[PDB]
Amino acid sequence: PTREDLVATAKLFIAKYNEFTPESIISVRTPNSVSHRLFPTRNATRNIGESMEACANAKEVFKSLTVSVIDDNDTIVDERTRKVVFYLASRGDTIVGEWKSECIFIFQMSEDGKLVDRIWAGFDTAYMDEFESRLDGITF
Amino acid sequence: PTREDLVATAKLFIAKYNEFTPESIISVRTPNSVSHRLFPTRNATRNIGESMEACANAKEVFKSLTVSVIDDNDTIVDERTRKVVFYLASRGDTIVGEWKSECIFIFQMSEDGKLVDRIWAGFDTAYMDEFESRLDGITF
Ligand SMILES: C=C1C[C@H]2[C@]3(C)CCC(=O)C(C)(C)[C@H]3C(=O)[C@@H](O)[C@]2(C)[C@H]2C(=O)O[C@](C)(C(=O)OC)C(=O)[C@]12C
Ligand SMILES: [Ca+2]
Ligand SMILES: [Ca+2]
Protein backbone atom coordinates (compact mmCIF):
# COMPACT_ATOMS: atom_id res chain seq x y z
CA PRO A 1 0.00 0.00 0.00
CA THR A 2 1.19 3.47 -0.91
CA ARG A 3 1.45 6.45 1.40
CA GLU A 4 -1.66 7.79 -0.34
CA ASP A 5 -3.39 4.43 0.26
CA LEU A 6 -2.71 4.55 4.01
CA VAL A 7 -4.00 8.12 4.46
CA ALA A 8 -7.08 7.38 2.35
CA THR A 9 -8.09 4.53 4.63
CA ALA A 10 -7.52 6.84 7.59
CA LYS A 11 -9.65 9.59 6.02
CA LEU A 12 -12.35 7.00 5.41
CA PHE A 13 -12.25 5.99 9.07
CA ILE A 14 -12.81 9.68 9.92
CA ALA A 15 -15.71 10.06 7.49
CA LYS A 16 -17.51 7.03 8.90
CA TYR A 17 -16.65 8.03 12.46
CA ASN A 18 -18.41 11.37 11.89
CA GLU A 19 -21.61 9.49 11.03
CA PHE A 20 -21.51 8.57 14.74
CA THR A 21 -23.41 5.27 14.76
CA PRO A 22 -22.20 1.94 16.18
CA GLU A 23 -22.30 0.60 12.63
CA SER A 24 -20.20 3.39 11.16
CA ILE A 25 -17.50 3.51 13.83
CA ILE A 26 -16.68 -0.15 13.11
CA SER A 27 -17.04 -0.16 9.29
CA VAL A 28 -13.40 0.70 8.54
CA ARG A 29 -12.03 -1.64 11.22
CA THR A 30 -10.92 -5.23 11.09
CA PRO A 31 -13.13 -7.31 13.42
CA ASN A 32 -10.10 -8.24 15.59
CA SER A 33 -8.93 -4.61 15.87
CA VAL A 34 -8.46 -2.95 19.25
CA SER A 35 -8.77 0.69 20.25
CA HIS A 36 -6.23 1.88 22.88
CA ARG A 37 -6.42 5.10 24.89
CA LEU A 38 -3.11 6.84 25.63
CA PHE A 39 -2.02 8.26 29.02
CA PRO A 40 -2.33 6.37 32.32
CA THR A 41 -5.22 8.37 33.81
CA ARG A 42 -7.45 7.24 30.91
CA ASN A 43 -5.87 4.08 29.50
CA ALA A 44 -8.41 1.60 28.12
CA THR A 45 -8.62 -1.08 25.43
CA ARG A 46 -11.79 -1.70 23.39
CA ASN A 47 -12.44 -4.46 20.91
CA ILE A 48 -15.12 -3.94 18.25
CA GLY A 49 -18.05 -4.83 20.52
CA GLU A 50 -16.83 -2.54 23.31
CA SER A 51 -16.41 0.27 20.77
CA MET A 52 -20.01 -0.17 19.59
CA GLU A 53 -21.24 -0.14 23.19
CA ALA A 54 -19.09 2.93 23.91
CA CYS A 55 -20.50 4.69 20.85
CA ALA A 56 -24.07 3.88 21.89
CA ASN A 57 -23.46 5.18 25.42
CA ALA A 58 -21.84 8.30 23.94
CA LYS A 59 -24.90 8.99 21.80
CA GLU A 60 -26.92 9.17 25.06
CA VAL A 61 -24.83 12.27 25.94
CA PHE A 62 -23.61 13.76 22.64
CA LYS A 63 -26.25 15.08 20.29
CA SER A 64 -23.56 15.71 17.63
CA LEU A 65 -19.86 14.93 17.37
CA THR A 66 -17.52 15.69 14.48
CA VAL A 67 -13.76 15.33 14.19
CA SER A 68 -11.56 16.72 11.44
CA VAL A 69 -7.90 16.68 10.55
CA ILE A 70 -6.77 20.23 11.24
CA ASP A 71 -3.98 20.26 8.66
CA ASP A 72 -2.78 17.60 6.24
CA ASN A 73 0.77 19.04 6.50
CA ASP A 74 1.02 17.65 10.02
CA THR A 75 -0.04 14.14 9.04
CA ILE A 76 2.56 11.43 9.66
CA VAL A 77 2.78 8.28 7.54
CA ASP A 78 5.07 5.30 8.10
CA GLU A 79 4.82 3.21 4.95
CA ARG A 80 6.76 0.38 6.55
CA THR A 81 4.66 -0.07 9.69
CA ARG A 82 1.44 1.01 7.88
CA LYS A 83 0.81 3.72 10.48
CA VAL A 84 -0.84 7.14 10.08
CA VAL A 85 -0.99 9.92 12.69
CA PHE A 86 -3.72 12.57 12.61
CA TYR A 87 -4.13 15.61 14.88
CA LEU A 88 -7.80 16.41 15.05
CA ALA A 89 -10.32 18.96 16.21
CA SER A 90 -13.40 17.48 17.86
CA ARG A 91 -16.58 19.55 18.26
CA GLY A 92 -19.88 18.43 19.69
CA ASP A 93 -23.16 19.22 21.40
CA THR A 94 -24.07 17.48 24.65
CA ILE A 95 -26.73 17.47 27.35
CA VAL A 96 -24.22 19.21 29.62
CA GLY A 97 -23.15 21.73 27.00
CA GLU A 98 -20.55 22.21 24.33
CA TRP A 99 -17.74 19.75 23.64
CA LYS A 100 -14.65 21.36 22.12
CA SER A 101 -11.23 19.72 22.18
CA GLU A 102 -8.36 18.29 20.18
CA CYS A 103 -6.86 14.83 20.13
CA ILE A 104 -4.26 12.75 18.35
CA PHE A 105 -5.30 9.59 16.52
CA ILE A 106 -2.87 6.89 15.43
CA PHE A 107 -3.92 4.21 12.97
CA GLN A 108 -2.13 1.02 12.05
CA MET A 109 -3.51 -0.27 8.78
CA SER A 110 -3.95 -3.90 7.74
CA GLU A 111 -1.46 -5.57 5.41
CA ASP A 112 -3.45 -4.55 2.34
CA GLY A 113 -3.80 -1.06 3.82
CA LYS A 114 -7.59 -1.14 3.29
CA LEU A 115 -8.78 -1.45 6.91
CA VAL A 116 -7.76 -0.12 10.29
CA ASP A 117 -6.18 -2.85 12.42
CA ARG A 118 -5.24 -0.85 15.54
CA ILE A 119 -6.05 2.61 16.95
CA TRP A 120 -4.30 4.68 19.61
CA ALA A 121 -6.12 7.80 20.74
CA GLY A 122 -4.65 10.53 22.90
CA PHE A 123 -7.09 13.04 24.39
CA ASP A 124 -6.79 16.15 26.50
CA THR A 125 -7.40 14.15 29.68
CA ALA A 126 -7.86 17.23 31.89
CA TYR A 127 -10.58 18.37 29.51
CA MET A 128 -12.09 14.87 29.74
CA ASP A 129 -12.14 15.02 33.55
CA GLU A 130 -13.72 18.46 33.41
CA PHE A 131 -16.37 17.25 30.96
CA GLU A 132 -17.01 14.26 33.21
CA SER A 133 -17.50 16.65 36.13
CA ARG A 134 -20.30 18.34 34.19
CA LEU A 135 -21.86 14.90 33.74
CA ASP A 136 -21.39 13.99 37.44
CA GLY A 137 -23.29 17.19 38.23
CA ILE A 138 -26.61 16.21 36.63
CA THR A 139 -29.50 16.93 38.98
CA PHE A 140 -32.96 17.38 37.35
CA PRO B 1 18.48 10.84 5.80
CA THR B 2 17.74 7.17 6.31
CA ARG B 3 15.04 5.76 8.57
CA GLU B 4 17.87 4.83 10.93
CA ASP B 5 19.37 8.34 10.70
CA LEU B 6 16.10 9.89 11.88
CA VAL B 7 15.71 7.52 14.82
CA ALA B 8 19.30 8.00 16.03
CA THR B 9 18.97 11.78 16.14
CA ALA B 10 15.73 11.40 18.12
CA LYS B 11 17.32 8.91 20.54
CA LEU B 12 20.11 11.45 21.04
CA PHE B 13 17.54 14.15 21.70
CA ILE B 14 16.04 11.83 24.33
CA ALA B 15 19.47 11.17 25.86
CA LYS B 16 20.32 14.86 26.21
CA TYR B 17 16.77 15.42 27.41
CA ASN B 18 17.37 13.08 30.32
CA GLU B 19 20.51 15.07 31.26
CA PHE B 20 17.94 17.81 31.92
CA THR B 21 19.96 21.01 31.85
CA PRO B 22 18.96 24.16 29.94
CA GLU B 23 21.99 23.50 27.71
CA SER B 24 21.50 19.77 27.13
CA ILE B 25 17.85 20.13 26.18
CA ILE B 26 18.80 22.45 23.30
CA SER B 27 22.04 20.78 22.21
CA VAL B 28 20.24 18.64 19.61
CA ARG B 29 18.02 21.48 18.32
CA THR B 30 18.33 23.91 15.44
CA PRO B 31 18.55 27.59 16.42
CA ASN B 32 15.10 28.43 15.02
CA SER B 33 13.41 25.23 16.20
CA VAL B 34 10.17 25.50 18.18
CA SER B 35 8.57 23.14 20.64
CA HIS B 36 4.76 22.84 20.69
CA ARG B 37 2.85 21.38 23.63
CA LEU B 38 -0.30 19.61 22.40
CA PHE B 39 -3.94 19.84 23.64
CA PRO B 40 -5.90 23.03 24.42
CA THR B 41 -5.51 23.00 28.21
CA ARG B 42 -1.70 23.09 27.97
CA ASN B 43 -1.02 24.63 24.57
CA ALA B 44 2.34 26.36 24.33
CA THR B 45 5.04 27.20 21.78
CA ARG B 46 8.65 27.71 22.88
CA ASN B 47 11.70 28.79 20.91
CA ILE B 48 15.18 27.91 22.18
CA GLY B 49 15.23 30.76 24.70
CA GLU B 50 11.90 30.01 26.32
CA SER B 51 12.73 26.28 26.41
CA MET B 52 15.89 26.95 28.43
CA GLU B 53 13.98 29.18 30.85
CA ALA B 54 11.22 26.58 31.21
CA CYS B 55 13.78 23.85 31.86
CA ALA B 56 15.58 26.00 34.45
CA ASN B 57 12.28 26.67 36.22
CA ALA B 58 11.30 23.01 36.07
CA LYS B 59 14.63 22.07 37.71
CA GLU B 60 13.40 23.81 40.88
CA VAL B 61 10.84 20.99 41.27
CA PHE B 62 12.20 18.02 39.29
CA LYS B 63 15.41 16.71 40.85
CA SER B 64 15.77 13.99 38.23
CA LEU B 65 13.88 13.06 35.08
CA THR B 66 13.94 10.00 32.85
CA VAL B 67 11.90 9.60 29.68
CA SER B 68 12.21 6.19 28.06
CA VAL B 69 10.93 4.65 24.86
CA ILE B 70 8.50 1.99 26.00
CA ASP B 71 8.75 -0.17 22.87
CA ASP B 72 11.06 0.28 19.89
CA ASN B 73 8.61 -1.73 17.81
CA ASP B 74 5.91 0.97 18.19
CA THR B 75 8.09 3.81 16.97
CA ILE B 76 6.79 5.62 13.89
CA VAL B 77 9.14 7.04 11.27
CA ASP B 78 8.13 9.20 8.29
CA GLU B 79 11.11 9.51 5.94
CA ARG B 80 9.24 11.84 3.59
CA THR B 81 8.50 14.40 6.33
CA ARG B 82 11.52 13.43 8.52
CA LYS B 83 9.33 12.78 11.55
CA VAL B 84 9.83 10.33 14.42
CA VAL B 85 7.13 9.51 16.97
CA PHE B 86 7.94 7.99 20.37
CA TYR B 87 5.50 6.84 23.04
CA LEU B 88 7.44 7.36 26.26
CA ALA B 89 7.22 6.55 29.95
CA SER B 90 8.31 9.51 32.07
CA ARG B 91 9.68 9.05 35.57
CA GLY B 92 10.60 11.96 37.79
CA ASP B 93 11.99 12.58 41.24
CA THR B 94 10.50 15.81 42.54
CA ILE B 95 10.14 17.84 45.72
CA VAL B 96 6.65 16.32 46.29
CA GLY B 97 7.55 12.73 45.48
CA GLU B 98 7.60 10.61 42.38
CA TRP B 99 6.38 11.67 38.94
CA LYS B 100 5.12 8.68 36.92
CA SER B 101 3.41 9.33 33.59
CA GLU B 102 3.49 8.73 29.84
CA CYS B 103 3.86 11.02 26.87
CA ILE B 104 4.07 11.01 23.09
CA PHE B 105 6.87 12.99 21.40
CA ILE B 106 6.98 14.00 17.76
CA PHE B 107 10.29 15.14 16.27
CA GLN B 108 10.77 16.69 12.85
CA MET B 109 14.41 16.52 11.81
CA SER B 110 16.42 19.07 9.85
CA GLU B 111 17.14 18.44 6.17
CA ASP B 112 20.41 16.65 6.95
CA GLY B 113 18.65 14.81 9.78
CA LYS B 114 21.32 15.57 12.38
CA LEU B 115 19.32 18.09 14.42
CA VAL B 116 15.75 18.44 15.69
CA ASP B 117 13.93 21.23 13.89
CA ARG B 118 10.46 20.89 15.45
CA ILE B 119 8.89 19.16 18.46
CA TRP B 120 5.36 18.36 19.51
CA ALA B 121 4.79 16.86 22.93
CA GLY B 122 1.56 15.35 24.19
CA PHE B 123 1.30 15.00 27.96
CA ASP B 124 -1.31 13.52 30.28
CA THR B 125 -2.83 16.87 31.13
CA ALA B 126 -5.00 15.61 34.00
CA TYR B 127 -1.88 14.26 35.65
CA MET B 128 -0.16 17.64 35.26
CA ASP B 129 -3.12 19.23 37.07
CA GLU B 130 -2.86 16.59 39.81
CA PHE B 131 0.91 17.18 40.12
CA GLU B 132 0.38 20.94 40.36
CA SER B 133 -2.18 20.09 43.04
CA ARG B 134 0.48 18.17 44.95
CA LEU B 135 2.71 21.27 44.79
CA ASP B 136 -0.09 23.47 46.16
CA GLY B 137 0.04 21.26 49.27
CA ILE B 138 3.65 21.96 50.34
CA THR B 139 3.11 23.09 53.88
CA PHE B 140 6.01 23.04 56.41
C1 LIG C 1 12.73 19.44 30.00
C2 LIG C 1 11.54 20.16 29.95
C3 LIG C 1 10.76 20.00 31.07
C4 LIG C 1 9.38 19.63 30.67
C5 LIG C 1 8.63 19.04 31.87
C6 LIG C 1 8.69 19.97 33.11
C7 LIG C 1 9.27 17.69 32.25
C8 LIG C 1 8.33 16.99 33.25
C9 LIG C 1 7.13 16.76 32.58
O1 LIG C 1 6.86 15.64 32.12
C10 LIG C 1 6.33 17.87 32.26
C11 LIG C 1 5.13 17.39 31.44
C12 LIG C 1 5.82 18.53 33.56
C13 LIG C 1 7.21 18.73 31.31
C14 LIG C 1 6.68 19.93 30.78
O2 LIG C 1 5.88 20.65 31.36
C15 LIG C 1 7.28 20.30 29.57
O3 LIG C 1 6.51 21.31 28.90
C16 LIG C 1 8.69 20.81 29.89
C17 LIG C 1 8.54 22.15 30.63
C18 LIG C 1 9.61 20.92 28.60
C19 LIG C 1 9.20 21.87 27.62
O4 LIG C 1 8.06 22.34 27.57
O5 LIG C 1 10.16 22.24 26.71
C20 LIG C 1 11.31 21.37 26.53
C21 LIG C 1 12.42 22.17 25.84
C22 LIG C 1 11.00 20.28 25.69
O6 LIG C 1 11.32 19.13 25.97
O7 LIG C 1 10.39 20.61 24.52
C23 LIG C 1 11.13 19.93 23.49
C24 LIG C 1 11.87 20.95 27.72
O8 LIG C 1 13.05 20.59 27.67
C25 LIG C 1 11.16 21.08 28.93
C26 LIG C 1 11.54 22.48 29.43
CA1 LIG D 1 -17.74 10.54 37.29
CA1 LIG E 1 -1.56 25.92 41.75
Curated annotation (Swiss-Prot), chains A, B:
Positions contributing to substrate binding: 17, 37, 46
UniProt gene name: trt14
Effect annotated for changing residue 35 to V: Does not significantly affect the catalytic activity
Record's protein name: Isomerase trt14
Summary of the function given for this chain in its UniProt record: Isomerase; part of the gene cluster that mediates the biosynthesis of terretonin, a fungal meroterpenoid that acts as a mycotoxin. The first step of the pathway is the synthesis of 3,5-dimethylorsellinic acid (DMOA) by the polyketide synthase trt4. DMOA is then prenylated into farnesyl-DMOA by the polyprenyl transferase trt2. Methylation by the methyltransferase trt5 then leads to farnesyl-DMOA methyl ester which is further subject to epoxidation by the FAD-dependent monooxygenase trt8 to yield epoxyfarnesyl-DMOA methyl ester.
Phenotype when changing residue 17 to F: Alters the stereochemistry and the specificity of the enzyme reaction
Keyword annotations from UniProtKB, A to Z: Isomerase
Result of altering residue 17 to A: Leads to a dramatic decrease of the catalytic activity
Gene Ontology biological process terms in this record: terpenoid biosynthetic process
Traits of the deletion mutant: Impairs the synthesis of terretonin but accumulates terretonin C.
InterPro entries xrefs: Fungal_Meroterpenoid_Isomerase
UniProt GO MF annotations: isomerase activity
Family, as annotated: Belongs to the trt14 isomerase family.
Subunit structure, as described in the record: Homodimer.
EC identifiers of the protein: 5.-.-.-
Spans annotated as Substrate: 35-37
Pathway(s) served: Secondary metabolite biosynthesis; terpenoid biosynthesis
